[PDB]
Homo-oligomer: A and B are copies of this chain.
Amino acid sequence: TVSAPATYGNFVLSPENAVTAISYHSILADFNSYKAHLTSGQPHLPNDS
């Protein structure tokens, strides 16, 4: 037996991203995540998108 995933994942956009989409045409994933790490100064995020 193998414990394979049973469901497709999802990647819902954050509302803050939508303001950054309407203006300049670019989107970085998890915009709230980077904001909380620049304040602490930590460079290594736990996870990526």
Contacts and interface: CB of A to CB of B under 8 A. Distances in A.
Majority secondary structure, A binding face = helix
Chain A contact patch, size range: 10 to 19
Number of copies of this chain in the oligomer? 2
A20 B31 CA distance: 9
A5 to B, nearest CB: 31
B34 A28 contact: no
B26 A26 contact: no
A19 B19 CA distance: 14
A23 interface: yes
A39 interface: yes
Contacts of A20: 20
Contacts of A15: 35, 38-39
